[PDB]
Design a protein around this nucleic acid. Structure first.
Lengths: 56, 49
DNA sequence: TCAAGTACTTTTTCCGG
RNA sequence: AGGA
DNA sequence: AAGTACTTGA
C-alpha cells in the first residue's frame, strides 16, 4: 500500500530507538547500573554502525 | 442418643503433611507493580496479585 | 513435469529458591 | 523443586 | 506429533 507500507520500507535506513520505558535499567542500589538487554543490543548496533561509517 | 449406625472405629496412622493453610492464604488489593509492564508483581511472598 | 526428501516450522491445564 |  | 513450504532428480 502506497501510504502505510511501500516495499522499499522492509529495508531499514533509519532505525527507531525505543525509549527507556521499553528497555528499563533495573537500577539495584545507587552507584550500580543494570541496563536492559535491548539497551546493550542497541549499543552493539550503534558500535557496529560507527565501525562501518568511519571505515567507508 | 445412640447412633442407628455402628461406626468403624479404631487406630490408623495418619501423617501431617507439608501443606498448611496459613502458609498458602493470600489476598491483595493494590500493591507492588512490575517496572517493565507496570502490572502486579508475582507471588504471595512479594505481595503479588 | 511430478513424486519424494529437504528446510523448518510449532504446540502442550492451573497454581517456591 | 512441589501442589489441584 | 504432525504438519506447511520449498527444493531435488526422474
Amino acid at each position: 500500500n502506497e501510504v502505510f507500507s511501500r516495499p522499499e520500507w522492509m529495508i531499514l535506513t533509519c532505525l527507531p530507538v525505543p525509549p527507556p520505558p521499553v528497555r528499563p535499567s533495573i537500577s539495584f542500589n545507587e552507584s550500580q547500573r543494570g541496563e536492559d538487554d535491548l539497551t546493550f543490543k542497541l549499543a552493539d548496533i550503534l558500535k557496529a554502525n560507527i565501525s562501518l561509517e568511519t571505515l567507508e | 442418643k445412640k447412633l442407628m449406625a455402628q461406626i468403624f472405629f479404631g487406630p490408623t496412622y495418619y501423617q501431617r503433611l507439608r501443606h498448611m493453610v496459613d502458609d498458602k492464604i493470600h489476598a491483595r488489593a493494590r500493591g507492588p507493580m512490575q517496572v517493565l509492564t507496570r502490572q502486579p508483581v508475582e507471588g504471595r511472598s512479594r505481595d503479588g496479585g
